[PDB]
Amino acid sequence: SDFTLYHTWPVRVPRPVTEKLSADYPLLTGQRVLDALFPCVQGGTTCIPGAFGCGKTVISQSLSKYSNSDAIIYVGCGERGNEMAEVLMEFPELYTEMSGTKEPIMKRTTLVANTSNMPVAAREASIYTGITLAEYFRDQGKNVSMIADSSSRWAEALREISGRLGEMPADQGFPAYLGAKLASFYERAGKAVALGSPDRTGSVS
Amino acid sequence: YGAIYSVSGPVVIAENMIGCAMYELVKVGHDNLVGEVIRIDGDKATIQVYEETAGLTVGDPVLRTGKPLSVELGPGLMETIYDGIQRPLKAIKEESQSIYIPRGIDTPALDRTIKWQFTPGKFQVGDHISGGDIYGSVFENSLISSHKILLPPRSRGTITWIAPAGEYTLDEKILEVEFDGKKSDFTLYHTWPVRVPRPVTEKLSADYPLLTGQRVLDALFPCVQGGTTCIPGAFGCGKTVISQSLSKYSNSDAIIYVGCGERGNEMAEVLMEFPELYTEMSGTKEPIMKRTTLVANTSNMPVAAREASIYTGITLAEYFRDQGKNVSMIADSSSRWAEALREISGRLGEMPADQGFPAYLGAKLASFYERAGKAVALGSPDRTGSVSIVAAVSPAGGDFSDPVTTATLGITQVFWGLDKKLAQRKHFPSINTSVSYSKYTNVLNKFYDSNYPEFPVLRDRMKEILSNAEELEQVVQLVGKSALSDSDKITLDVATLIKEDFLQQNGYSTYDAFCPIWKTFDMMRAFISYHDEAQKAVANGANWSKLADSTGDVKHAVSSSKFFEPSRGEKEVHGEFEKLLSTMQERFAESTD
Amino acid sequence: VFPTRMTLGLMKTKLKGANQGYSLLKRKSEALTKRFRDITKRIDD
Amino acid sequence: NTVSGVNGPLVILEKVKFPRYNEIVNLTLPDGTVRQGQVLEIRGDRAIVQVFEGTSGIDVKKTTVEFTGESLRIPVSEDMLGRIFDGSGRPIDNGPKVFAEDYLDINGSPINPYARIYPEEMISTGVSAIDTMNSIARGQKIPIFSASGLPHNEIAAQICRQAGLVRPTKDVHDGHEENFSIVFAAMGVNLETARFFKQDFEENGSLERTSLFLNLANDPTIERIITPRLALTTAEYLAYQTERHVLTILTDMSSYADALREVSAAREEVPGRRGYPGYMYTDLSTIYERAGRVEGRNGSITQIPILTMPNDDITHPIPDLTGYITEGQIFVDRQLHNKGIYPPINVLPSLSRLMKSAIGEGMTRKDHGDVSNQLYAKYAIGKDAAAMKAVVGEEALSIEDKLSLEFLEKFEKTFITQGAYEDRTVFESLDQAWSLLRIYPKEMLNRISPKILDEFY
Amino acid sequence: NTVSGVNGPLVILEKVKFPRYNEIVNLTLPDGTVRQGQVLEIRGDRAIVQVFEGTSGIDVKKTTVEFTGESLRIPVSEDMLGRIFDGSGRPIDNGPKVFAEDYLDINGSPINPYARIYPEEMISTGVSAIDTMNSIARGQKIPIFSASGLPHNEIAAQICRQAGLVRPTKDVHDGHEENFSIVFAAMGVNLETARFFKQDFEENGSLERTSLFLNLANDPTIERIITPRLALTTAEYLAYQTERHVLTILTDMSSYADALREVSAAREEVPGRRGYPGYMYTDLSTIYERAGRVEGRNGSITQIPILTMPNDDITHPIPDLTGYITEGQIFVDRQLHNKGIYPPINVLPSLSRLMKSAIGEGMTRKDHGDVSNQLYAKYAIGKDAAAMKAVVGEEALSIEDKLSLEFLEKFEKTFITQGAYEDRTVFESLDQAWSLLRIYPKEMLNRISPKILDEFY
Amino acid sequence: LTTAEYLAYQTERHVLTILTDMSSYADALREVSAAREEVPGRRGYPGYMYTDLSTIYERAGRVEGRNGSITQIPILTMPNDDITHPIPDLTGYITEGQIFVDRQLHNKGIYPPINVLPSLSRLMKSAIG
Amino acid sequence: AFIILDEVIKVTNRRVNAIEHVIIPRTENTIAYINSELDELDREEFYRLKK
């Protein structure tokens, strides 16, 4: 077949590697308590409580700022849409902590920003699209910070689809397929050596 | 026409049935049972038969009569106890030798052999007429004419014939109207489908308060006329007893009392008790009974029979409103109507959507309450009528946020509480001050304000005392009584006085259980005049204990307010209460010093 | 054992009761303990 | 023609359109044995039956069917008492031969008696906790709510045993001079329990006066529920036609309920709310159909159904639907049982709302309503105080609360403690109620009108 | 083709498959009665429609169907302000048509004519309590969550009527120099309650500023869901094209939840917990999609939804899901209502996720964000301190808490208590705030900069 | 299991099976129940949840020659952190005892955090000689 | 007075700790178990009817 500068990869299929490693490498956030007290990992899985705009969106915006990862992929799974607007505007005025230029934070960020109003396909595809993209950057030899906001919303995208179709959802009215889908997503992320003879190291956190 | 496809439950399904509507009257089988085709699924029509099936065969013919199922609104409505679609129960006792007819009998909607007095109206030959116009009357109450015979909606034209005053039968003509050719001849009654509303020219906000008589109901918020009201239950809250008390005390022109799906013993209670009870204004023959038109349906009658109940009753209320009469509709229990909607849901075998309740449940409730309300009467003469609905509720879903209670509390405008535990302990009718609101309060109180009462100012302070009492109640339980200040003790102490006198209601009508609205204001005036003095004393120095000893005599009197009657002081308020305001002041001056 | 349907309204209010109780009695305690410390020092002297 | 299928115990017969609703069919099996069945539904060129007899012996197409031609009706006669029946009608004494003078519908659609005369005179039980608190009047349907994990069957046997000394208690009250009959309906009842029941009636000497309809749960479900319905119809014959007074004890209502759920699972009907049907209410109302004073206004049929709360709650489907159709309830406590107070009835959530109407003068006092009100209020406070003693301590308590703690103990151990064979008159029971009430002076009692108080204190 | 059947709310038509979805059909009855509906489902030679008015009274061979050929849209114009419509967009004027300049589809718009821009300018409700503590901003949605212990519609009326009296106060401040409009939607309102809202707009002069679309409690569930979609499109036109800030008031969202729950998202399909769909979220999200800042950058639609909490519950699906999509909430309570506090608004469980950051500076002073920290803190401490007063007295009560005890009282009785038609500008609201804090010295307002505090105290 | 009973059988070996995690396996059963024409019973999990678990537990015990065996320690993580949730309740009934780990211990820095308050094993005088 | 204070502080301390440990977590455990059962009824009901 013919090849282009871009390549396509299916959203629920994760990109491949030669083998995955146990991460031992931290985030480049440089947030002092983050580093010392309960050390940041890059190639890790992390759950943070929220309740919306009582700090949680604030820290995601902080994490973006202090970070200076090779790429950062920002996922709004299904947020309030004031918050998505805010992420877009603040970032090119902000400054990268490695001292780079050209709309600084925004230049390193690629944004999949779905508010919950925007179609349900786009909400469900959002995490998927981010993980496949991120995983490819892991194959490129780039250390990626993956920020998702929020998985509670994301579980809801699924429950909606389930009731419409007329299949039975399971525990707490939330579907059967839920648990396998949450689980696959965190285990996909982590530190690996990319596919092919060069064997560059990346991470997805 | 049709052939019976299935008989399943008391529900019958019949094939070869097309050209039938969803309101169409149908006669089921070759025993000709009363039925109505509720829904149709294909060639097969689903029919609820309002008598039981205990030997209904398949393949017997089903004959569509070619017209809807209606009820007759006409002469003979009052002084009579009826079933869910209205056929004289009294005639049935004697003839059929049974309380309601055997399956496979049909009896006519009214007495056909009884002759009634026609009076001609204000619409003679060549005068134009429209629906809700008075073409005549019958007499069905002694002191008044309680029944205006009105033209049905969408009836118009000019009159070829007005029959002169005299006795006629109800099947014989008294009016002819010419419109599009001959429109019809009309008889003393008219038919109107009962599932369907009776139109209004326009609705005008409820703003006329008129008694409930009960001491608590009058007190927290004013009584209302043209309003809509929810009162909780559990079918062990003395719901029957307050209903009987409610009938006597309301002074409205007409009352419709509807037993939705009741015990039978409850129906005995009311039928027997009503003629013994004296109408407060001035009596009639068998006083309360004669002013009540009864739909009395038991639960042991099929599910079909209980659903037509609420409907026919509101349709008698809406006619009366259009007639120029203020109506009290007392419905007990609206949760039994909702119980019935569940039963038809199980029988039809439809899926739930409302926590174990049918799809149509929320909408059916909402529609009922709108038919009720204060209005300017339908018709070209224009008269005033209002329908105030007092509706009982109770759970029915095993939950405290149950579909019957939630959808009804939305559409209601007065909400007065009631707790099961208090009611058993003796405080019926009971009332919960933090689980109540009334939207009509603002205008109604201002009405009582102008007539003599200082009423608005008192109402807000009564709730306030009770609010602080709840907060206090938790501290009192936990820490004890040994920590509260002098002010806080009083709050509880005046709260006791209100709990004693308003929430408790001694007897049917004995111990002067009847309080007029003006007496209630005076009962309240005595307690809050006492509260302000009581608050000043502790603040100006006087121990809770010292203040209680010294108050003494004036406190016993206010405690004793409920046995006293206002008919021996003035006629609606007590000279004794006027004297009480002077005594309070005098006491206070001695006690403080 | 525990009710099959709708203990939750009750249990909600039980939860509320408990929680208010702890706060108030800790305030009552807080005032007694605060006063007591001062009185202890007066007494030693 | 032949069986289309069998799904659970229910049978689908593919047959012609000559059977009516509730018309009996007679299933001819090639084992040389006939079983009988009742049509639950008739539908186009098929019938849905559940077989009353057997549960196997079925064939796919070696079956033959014939229609009985007769819809289920009870042979009711003047003498039905002093005889043991089954609802299935099997011979254990009598059952298939029982005499006949009418055949009556179980449906009770022709005669349907219903009060239109108020619940008249008092009915005695000799239990203070029934008569004083709730009070019973002729034609009343007041239920006994009991529990599982405690023997519900034992509380039914105490009521049975003291019943029929009751008729003398009424005789004394005057204006009762007519016969007393018990109509006992058993459905889901164990063989050992059945024998107990037989024993209670016997000891008083009411055996001669009682008719028994017996079903066990090894008989098919549809039969089990028809058995009390047949019995109420028999009661109706006694009540209306020969103007006698009937008290019918219907046990076990949970058992009636159990059947309802099982029946329907692939018909037009299907089980609704909480796994218990949505038409469960109708089924209870059919039992309520034949309750109230009868026509002509002498005699009455009075009904005390026996209901068991399975987890000791009112929010469960079986107690919840029922209590609405009833006009109050009587509440049985586990905690008085464990201590050893028998019969163990807590009066806190017990009220019957036609207490006022039930009581009158000449057989009950005017103080009677007032007396119940006082006991509830003190008993309630006492309970509330005992709970606070437990958590916080006796710093919350007050002197008034001490009177109340003391009042709880006196009430439980005197009022609620009595025999299983120790019957009383109503006047005595009000006299003992008073005894407990003497410990609060007049000024702390305000659940009685002060006028009445001065007389009886 | 003719009507096949109707099963509950849902109507089966056998009519051919050539109609498109959203396509209006006319039910031609032999009774001279024409009713309109929108196809819920279009299938192969059948369609399922739910009828906008009624559901029964149609036949299966005397009622015939015709397809209009035109889908569900609203004629949108700016001559619609001062005009009374129903829940299909038909007038209840009893005079002239709606008027169009475009026809806009009602579904959450065909094209989605919105952009996402963070809020930056204050919107004022004319009541201090909402505006200082939990401010409203352009394109931000903060619902009023109230309960069935409140007169929730009556409070709802106060918010709405006082709006657009704000616009001349904002005009002097220079925050809004472009017009104010009100779009009001009544879902499931009573005839009398509906009347109250209308009369309140006439009195204020706010009738000219609002268009009312009416759905009555007796109109079909499908009529009720059509009703807010009419209001938001009309708002979207005003907002986009003539640059007005438009404040849309949707009362009652609770009825809206009821219509969906009942049918049109539970037609025969399985809903989530407590009968309320799991895709009830998806429906709520459609409303939120047609709300927000729009092209022009002087145009936005700001939204105040009113949700009435069934029994004050925090585990029911309705406030929780709705509550995730909206940026905070205003919590109303029963407690204040009893005391005689009107409107009874508490600001402690309440939250506005973005206070200063949402709103601007230029028409609101800079002190708003700082002052809110102090008022919130004191208010919290204040609830606790009153409970403590009751026990300890004032002989051992803390000094900080003693001032907070008095603070609880004033916060309610002057900052939360206001008139019916009392309107207060934002500048004013801020001044009152400082007056309540003025009693405390500086050493108990230590969470604020000495520069700001020295100026504002 | 087939691997473990083959070693155990053929060359008379004790095989210890560490089967992590039991709820992950439950999870998959739950998805091919939603996909089946089955209705899920107790708390959104399969009404045939017993048959699944039981297939694993029948294979465990001594196998022919009585010098080979399969010994099991299955590992369960509590999906909702409750011992009323169906998974632990059936699982516990089919197995012989349980070993409890308590969160409060883990945080304190105890190792192993084996809280012995409900930890009991049925064979205690039938597992010793 | 000091001696009476001495007594009262011991009682009052017992109570704050008693509400804390025994009551609140008992109340958490109960509320959760019945909430989950209650929800199970509403969802399974729908599932059986739909099937």
Side-chain angles (χ1 to χ4, degrees), chain B residues 56 81 263-265 300 343 424 427 477, chain D residues 21 115 141 282 285 325 353 376 396 447:
Chain B
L56 187 53
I81 180 175
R263 280 72 274 183
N265 298 135
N300 295 156
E343 281 157 77
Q424 290 178 302
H427 293 283
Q477 297 170 17
Chain D
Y21 204 73
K141 41 182 161 277
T282 308
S285 309
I325 334 198
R353 39 175 187 106
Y376 292 134
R447 298 295 185 223

PDB file of all heavy atoms in Angstrom, chain B residues 56 81 263-265 300 343 424 427 477, chain D residues 21 115 141 282 285 325 353 376 396 447:
ATOM      1  N   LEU B  56     -67.265 -16.022  31.808  1.00  0.00           N
ATOM      2  CA  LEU B  56     -67.330 -15.263  30.590  1.00  0.00           C
ATOM      3  C   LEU B  56     -66.670 -16.204  29.547  1.00  0.00           C
ATOM      4  O   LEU B  56     -65.503 -16.635  29.706  1.00  0.00           O
ATOM      5  CB  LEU B  56     -66.717 -13.874  30.708  1.00  0.00           C
ATOM      6  CG  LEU B  56     -66.973 -13.031  29.401  1.00  0.00           C
ATOM      7  CD1 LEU B  56     -68.418 -12.916  28.930  1.00  0.00           C
ATOM      8  CD2 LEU B  56     -66.468 -11.610  29.598  1.00  0.00           C
ATOM      9  N   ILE B  81     -76.367   7.824  46.956  1.00  0.00           N
ATOM     10  CA  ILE B  81     -75.041   7.292  47.075  1.00  0.00           C
ATOM     11  C   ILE B  81     -74.920   6.459  45.863  1.00  0.00           C
ATOM     12  O   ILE B  81     -75.839   5.733  45.415  1.00  0.00           O
ATOM     13  CB  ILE B  81     -74.799   6.539  48.384  1.00  0.00           C
ATOM     14  CG1 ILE B  81     -73.334   5.974  48.458  1.00  0.00           C
ATOM     15  CG2 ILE B  81     -75.829   5.392  48.529  1.00  0.00           C
ATOM     16  CD1 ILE B  81     -72.980   5.307  49.775  1.00  0.00           C
ATOM     17  N   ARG B 263     -62.937   0.732  52.243  1.00  0.00           N
ATOM     18  CA  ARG B 263     -63.202  -0.472  52.986  1.00  0.00           C
ATOM     19  C   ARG B 263     -64.570  -1.029  52.845  1.00  0.00           C
ATOM     20  O   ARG B 263     -64.718  -2.254  52.899  1.00  0.00           O
ATOM     21  CB  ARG B 263     -62.986  -0.299  54.576  1.00  0.00           C
ATOM     22  CG  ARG B 263     -61.456  -0.394  54.969  1.00  0.00           C
ATOM     23  CD  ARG B 263     -60.527   0.711  54.636  1.00  0.00           C
ATOM     24  NE  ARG B 263     -60.009   0.520  53.249  1.00  0.00           N
ATOM     25  CZ  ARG B 263     -59.110   1.330  52.681  1.00  0.00           C
ATOM     26  NH1 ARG B 263     -58.743   2.474  53.393  1.00  0.00           N
ATOM     27  NH2 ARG B 263     -58.684   1.086  51.403  1.00  0.00           N
ATOM     28  N   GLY B 264     -65.607  -0.216  52.732  1.00  0.00           N
ATOM     29  CA  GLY B 264     -66.979  -0.646  52.759  1.00  0.00           C
ATOM     30  C   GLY B 264     -67.484  -0.289  54.118  1.00  0.00           C
ATOM     31  O   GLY B 264     -68.640   0.085  54.126  1.00  0.00           O
ATOM     32  N   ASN B 265     -66.670  -0.489  55.152  1.00  0.00           N
ATOM     33  CA  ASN B 265     -67.024  -0.104  56.471  1.00  0.00           C
ATOM     34  C   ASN B 265     -66.977   1.394  56.630  1.00  0.00           C
ATOM     35  O   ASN B 265     -67.832   1.995  57.316  1.00  0.00           O
ATOM     36  CB  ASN B 265     -66.015  -0.643  57.514  1.00  0.00           C
ATOM     37  CG  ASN B 265     -66.015  -2.141  57.488  1.00  0.00           C
ATOM     38  OD1 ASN B 265     -64.985  -2.831  57.493  1.00  0.00           O
ATOM     39  ND2 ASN B 265     -67.259  -2.696  57.601  1.00  0.00           N
ATOM     40  N   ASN B 300     -62.953  -3.614  46.647  1.00  0.00           N
ATOM     41  CA  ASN B 300     -63.183  -4.959  46.410  1.00  0.00           C
ATOM     42  C   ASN B 300     -63.908  -5.104  45.170  1.00  0.00           C
ATOM     43  O   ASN B 300     -64.038  -6.251  44.677  1.00  0.00           O
ATOM     44  CB  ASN B 300     -64.165  -5.330  47.471  1.00  0.00           C
ATOM     45  CG  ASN B 300     -63.546  -5.207  48.890  1.00  0.00           C
ATOM     46  OD1 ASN B 300     -64.336  -5.041  49.829  1.00  0.00           O
ATOM     47  ND2 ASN B 300     -62.213  -5.155  49.100  1.00  0.00           N
ATOM     48  N   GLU B 343     -52.531  -1.511  39.375  1.00  0.00           N
ATOM     49  CA  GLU B 343     -53.249  -2.761  39.170  1.00  0.00           C
ATOM     50  C   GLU B 343     -53.594  -3.014  37.680  1.00  0.00           C
ATOM     51  O   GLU B 343     -53.452  -4.132  37.210  1.00  0.00           O
ATOM     52  CB  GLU B 343     -54.446  -2.922  40.086  1.00  0.00           C
ATOM     53  CG  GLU B 343     -54.124  -3.372  41.539  1.00  0.00           C
ATOM     54  CD  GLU B 343     -55.184  -2.987  42.485  1.00  0.00           C
ATOM     55  OE1 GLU B 343     -56.248  -3.690  42.483  1.00  0.00           O
ATOM     56  OE2 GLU B 343     -55.068  -1.869  43.101  1.00  0.00           O
ATOM     57  N   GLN B 424     -51.307   8.542  66.276  1.00  0.00           N
ATOM     58  CA  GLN B 424     -51.606   7.398  67.102  1.00  0.00           C
ATOM     59  C   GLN B 424     -51.552   7.827  68.579  1.00  0.00           C
ATOM     60  O   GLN B 424     -52.356   7.412  69.392  1.00  0.00           O
ATOM     61  CB  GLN B 424     -50.602   6.211  66.827  1.00  0.00           C
ATOM     62  CG  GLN B 424     -50.779   5.520  65.449  1.00  0.00           C
ATOM     63  CD  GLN B 424     -49.742   4.358  65.172  1.00  0.00           C
ATOM     64  OE1 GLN B 424     -48.550   4.529  65.187  1.00  0.00           O
ATOM     65  NE2 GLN B 424     -50.243   3.088  64.839  1.00  0.00           N
ATOM     66  N   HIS B 427     -53.071  13.324  68.662  1.00  0.00           N
ATOM     67  CA  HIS B 427     -52.738  14.619  68.186  1.00  0.00           C
ATOM     68  C   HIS B 427     -53.253  14.703  66.826  1.00  0.00           C
ATOM     69  O   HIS B 427     -52.797  15.548  66.044  1.00  0.00           O
ATOM     70  CB  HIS B 427     -51.255  14.948  68.079  1.00  0.00           C
ATOM     71  CG  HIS B 427     -50.423  15.062  69.338  1.00  0.00           C
ATOM     72  ND1 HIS B 427     -50.462  16.163  70.149  1.00  0.00           N
ATOM     73  CD2 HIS B 427     -49.346  14.283  69.703  1.00  0.00           C
ATOM     74  CE1 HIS B 427     -49.353  16.085  70.896  1.00  0.00           C
ATOM     75  NE2 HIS B 427     -48.640  14.917  70.729  1.00  0.00           N
ATOM     76  N   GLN B 477     -32.403  16.393  74.154  1.00  0.00           N
ATOM     77  CA  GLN B 477     -32.212  14.999  74.150  1.00  0.00           C
ATOM     78  C   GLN B 477     -30.835  14.563  74.671  1.00  0.00           C
ATOM     79  O   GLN B 477     -30.676  13.642  75.513  1.00  0.00           O
ATOM     80  CB  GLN B 477     -32.440  14.380  72.779  1.00  0.00           C
ATOM     81  CG  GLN B 477     -33.888  14.534  72.248  1.00  0.00           C
ATOM     82  CD  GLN B 477     -33.866  14.080  70.785  1.00  0.00           C
ATOM     83  OE1 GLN B 477     -32.920  13.403  70.329  1.00  0.00           O
ATOM     84  NE2 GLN B 477     -34.993  14.372  70.063  1.00  0.00           N
TER      85      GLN B 477
ATOM     86  N   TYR D  21     -64.639 -18.815  31.611  1.00  0.00           N
ATOM     87  CA  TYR D  21     -63.695 -18.292  32.592  1.00  0.00           C
ATOM     88  C   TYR D  21     -63.930 -19.012  33.872  1.00  0.00           C
ATOM     89  O   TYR D  21     -65.089 -19.119  34.315  1.00  0.00           O
ATOM     90  CB  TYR D  21     -63.780 -16.772  32.737  1.00  0.00           C
ATOM     91  CG  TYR D  21     -62.491 -16.183  33.253  1.00  0.00           C
ATOM     92  CD1 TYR D  21     -61.253 -16.019  32.560  1.00  0.00           C
ATOM     93  CD2 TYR D  21     -62.542 -15.894  34.653  1.00  0.00           C
ATOM     94  CE1 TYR D  21     -60.086 -15.674  33.286  1.00  0.00           C
ATOM     95  CE2 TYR D  21     -61.441 -15.265  35.278  1.00  0.00           C
ATOM     96  CZ  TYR D  21     -60.240 -15.174  34.579  1.00  0.00           C
ATOM     97  OH  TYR D  21     -59.168 -14.918  35.422  1.00  0.00           O
ATOM     98  N   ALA D 115     -70.787  -3.620  54.268  1.00  0.00           N
ATOM     99  CA  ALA D 115     -71.387  -2.734  55.238  1.00  0.00           C
ATOM    100  C   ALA D 115     -71.934  -1.536  54.536  1.00  0.00           C
ATOM    101  O   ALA D 115     -71.320  -0.878  53.687  1.00  0.00           O
ATOM    102  CB  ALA D 115     -70.497  -2.274  56.446  1.00  0.00           C
ATOM    103  N   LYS D 141     -62.324  -5.746  59.771  1.00  0.00           N
ATOM    104  CA  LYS D 141     -61.206  -6.476  59.285  1.00  0.00           C
ATOM    105  C   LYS D 141     -59.999  -5.835  59.836  1.00  0.00           C
ATOM    106  O   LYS D 141     -59.449  -4.938  59.183  1.00  0.00           O
ATOM    107  CB  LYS D 141     -61.251  -6.607  57.708  1.00  0.00           C
ATOM    108  CG  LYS D 141     -61.723  -5.271  57.065  1.00  0.00           C
ATOM    109  CD  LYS D 141     -61.853  -5.272  55.540  1.00  0.00           C
ATOM    110  CE  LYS D 141     -62.741  -4.138  55.032  1.00  0.00           C
ATOM    111  NZ  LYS D 141     -64.204  -4.333  55.031  1.00  0.00           N
ATOM    112  N   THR D 282     -55.545  -6.628  44.297  1.00  0.00           N
ATOM    113  CA  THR D 282     -56.873  -7.069  43.885  1.00  0.00           C
ATOM    114  C   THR D 282     -57.221  -8.297  44.665  1.00  0.00           C
ATOM    115  O   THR D 282     -58.383  -8.482  45.046  1.00  0.00           O
ATOM    116  CB  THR D 282     -56.791  -7.377  42.431  1.00  0.00           C
ATOM    117  OG1 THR D 282     -56.223  -6.300  41.629  1.00  0.00           O
ATOM    118  CG2 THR D 282     -58.147  -7.756  41.790  1.00  0.00           C
ATOM    119  N   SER D 285     -58.133  -7.654  48.086  1.00  0.00           N
ATOM    120  CA  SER D 285     -59.483  -7.115  48.090  1.00  0.00           C
ATOM    121  C   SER D 285     -60.508  -8.195  47.910  1.00  0.00           C
ATOM    122  O   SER D 285     -61.569  -8.024  48.507  1.00  0.00           O
ATOM    123  CB  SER D 285     -59.615  -6.100  47.057  1.00  0.00           C
ATOM    124  OG  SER D 285     -58.489  -5.152  47.255  1.00  0.00           O
ATOM    125  N   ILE D 325     -55.361  -1.585  52.974  1.00  0.00           N
ATOM    126  CA  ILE D 325     -56.686  -2.114  52.772  1.00  0.00           C
ATOM    127  C   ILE D 325     -57.300  -2.211  54.158  1.00  0.00           C
ATOM    128  O   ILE D 325     -58.459  -1.895  54.337  1.00  0.00           O
ATOM    129  CB  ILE D 325     -56.831  -3.475  52.163  1.00  0.00           C
ATOM    130  CG1 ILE D 325     -55.562  -3.691  51.323  1.00  0.00           C
ATOM    131  CG2 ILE D 325     -58.158  -3.480  51.266  1.00  0.00           C
ATOM    132  CD1 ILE D 325     -55.678  -4.761  50.314  1.00  0.00           C
ATOM    133  N   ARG D 353     -58.585   2.770  63.408  1.00  0.00           N
ATOM    134  CA  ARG D 353     -59.028   4.171  63.276  1.00  0.00           C
ATOM    135  C   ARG D 353     -60.495   4.309  63.385  1.00  0.00           C
ATOM    136  O   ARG D 353     -60.961   5.445  63.343  1.00  0.00           O
ATOM    137  CB  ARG D 353     -58.430   4.853  62.037  1.00  0.00           C
ATOM    138  CG  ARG D 353     -58.309   4.027  60.749  1.00  0.00           C
ATOM    139  CD  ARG D 353     -57.807   4.950  59.664  1.00  0.00           C
ATOM    140  NE  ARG D 353     -57.899   4.059  58.406  1.00  0.00           N
ATOM    141  CZ  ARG D 353     -58.858   4.233  57.470  1.00  0.00           C
ATOM    142  NH1 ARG D 353     -59.882   5.139  57.663  1.00  0.00           N
ATOM    143  NH2 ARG D 353     -58.911   3.574  56.246  1.00  0.00           N
ATOM    144  N   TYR D 376     -50.373   5.161  75.109  1.00  0.00           N
ATOM    145  CA  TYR D 376     -49.461   5.293  73.976  1.00  0.00           C
ATOM    146  C   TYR D 376     -48.386   6.293  74.186  1.00  0.00           C
ATOM    147  O   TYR D 376     -47.199   6.081  73.879  1.00  0.00           O
ATOM    148  CB  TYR D 376     -50.209   5.813  72.691  1.00  0.00           C
ATOM    149  CG  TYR D 376     -51.183   4.877  72.097  1.00  0.00           C
ATOM    150  CD1 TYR D 376     -52.438   5.421  71.750  1.00  0.00           C
ATOM    151  CD2 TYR D 376     -50.920   3.558  71.694  1.00  0.00           C
ATOM    152  CE1 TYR D 376     -53.403   4.722  71.070  1.00  0.00           C
ATOM    153  CE2 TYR D 376     -51.905   2.762  71.061  1.00  0.00           C
ATOM    154  CZ  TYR D 376     -53.145   3.373  70.790  1.00  0.00           C
ATOM    155  OH  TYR D 376     -54.188   2.478  70.438  1.00  0.00           O
ATOM    156  N   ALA D 396     -28.654  13.638  80.385  1.00  0.00           N
ATOM    157  CA  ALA D 396     -29.767  13.969  79.572  1.00  0.00           C
ATOM    158  C   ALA D 396     -31.108  13.792  80.268  1.00  0.00           C
ATOM    159  O   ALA D 396     -31.958  14.605  80.033  1.00  0.00           O
ATOM    160  CB  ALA D 396     -29.883  13.057  78.318  1.00  0.00           C
ATOM    161  N   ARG D 447     -54.275  13.504  77.942  1.00  0.00           N
ATOM    162  CA  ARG D 447     -54.797  12.727  76.841  1.00  0.00           C
ATOM    163  C   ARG D 447     -56.214  12.313  77.079  1.00  0.00           C
ATOM    164  O   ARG D 447     -56.728  11.469  76.294  1.00  0.00           O
ATOM    165  CB  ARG D 447     -53.836  11.542  76.631  1.00  0.00           C
ATOM    166  CG  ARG D 447     -52.376  11.893  76.241  1.00  0.00           C
ATOM    167  CD  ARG D 447     -52.300  12.590  74.838  1.00  0.00           C
ATOM    168  NE  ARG D 447     -50.830  12.770  74.491  1.00  0.00           N
ATOM    169  CZ  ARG D 447     -50.238  13.835  73.956  1.00  0.00           C
ATOM    170  NH1 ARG D 447     -50.922  15.004  73.731  1.00  0.00           N
ATOM    171  NH2 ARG D 447     -48.964  13.689  73.419  1.00  0.00           N
TER     172      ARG D 447
END
